[PDB]
Amino acid sequence: NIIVFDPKGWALFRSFKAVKEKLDTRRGSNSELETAVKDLGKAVSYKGM
Amino acid sequence: DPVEVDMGRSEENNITQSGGTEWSKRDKSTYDPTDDIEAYALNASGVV
């Protein structure tokens, strides 16, 4: 129930069109996630769920 | 008389864009600008 991404790996995983689409479907899923710029300075940052 | 001031900033800051990643020759309609932003901001010593 938890996944640790290095920033380059997270950028690679976010680049896919479909993983963005898993957030935009009305009834497809319930994936709250901030796929934008967030918490640039600090070390550990939590990206939704 | 020419007098300069230089508060110590490392070369890794004030990044220019050369070769690739020009943000112009790169495809629009398929590239997200966030990836460069996150990487550039990596050098900042503190929250931005």
Burial of B34 (0-12, 13-18, 19+ CB in 10 A): middle
Q: Which amino acid is residue B33, in one-letter code?
A: P
Contact pairs from chain A to chain B, CB under 8 Å: 28
- State the CB neighbour count (10 A cutoff) for residue B2: 3
Whose tokens are 């931005």? That residue is B48
Note whether B23 and B17 are within 8 A (CB). yes
| Chain B nearest C-alpha distance from A42 (Å) | 6
What torsion do the CA atoms of A5, A8, A13, A16 make, to the nearest 10 degrees? 160
State this model's resolution in angstroms: 4.0
Q: What is the DSSP string of B1-48?
A: ----------TTSS----SS--SSSS-SSS--THHHHHHHGGG-SS--
Q: How far apart are CA B43 and CA A37, in angstroms?
A: 15
| Chain A nearest C-alpha distance from B13 (Å) | 15
